[PDB]
Amino acid sequence: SRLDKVEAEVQIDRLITGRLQSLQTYVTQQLIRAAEIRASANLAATKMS
C-alpha cells in the first residue's frame, strides 16, 4: 500500500527470505523429530514381535 514496486521489492524480498527461513527451520526440526519417532516406532515394532 505504501511503496511502489521498485521500492516495494526490497522489503518484500526481506520478508520472503525471513519467512522461507522460518519454514526451513520448521521442516528441519520436523525431520529430526520424525527420525526420533521412527527410532521409537522401530523399537515398538521389535517389542511387538
Partner 1 sequence: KIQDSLSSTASALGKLQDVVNQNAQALNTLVKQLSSNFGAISSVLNDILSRLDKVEAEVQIDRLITGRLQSLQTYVTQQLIRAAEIRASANLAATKMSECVLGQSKRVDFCGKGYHLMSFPQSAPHGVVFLHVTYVPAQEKNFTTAPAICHDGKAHFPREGVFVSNGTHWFVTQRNFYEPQIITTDNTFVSGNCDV
Partner 2 sequence: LSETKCTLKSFTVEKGIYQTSNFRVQPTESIVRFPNITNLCPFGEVFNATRFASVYAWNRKRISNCVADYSVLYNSASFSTFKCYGVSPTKLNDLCFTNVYADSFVIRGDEVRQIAPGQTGKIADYNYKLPDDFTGCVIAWNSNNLD
The binding site for partner 1 (CB under 8 A) comprises: 9, 13, 16-17, 21, 24-25, 28-29, 31-32, 35-36, 38-39, 46, 49
Identify the residue among 3, 26, 28, 37 touching a copy of itself (CB under 8 A): 28
Q: Which residues contact 3 (CB under 8 A, 6 or more apart)?
A: 11
Sites for partner 2 among residues 7-26 (CB under 8 A): 7-8
Contact call for residue 27 and partner 2 (CB under 8 A): no
The separation between CA 16 and the C-alpha centre of its own chain, rounded to angstroms, equals 14
DSSP 48: H
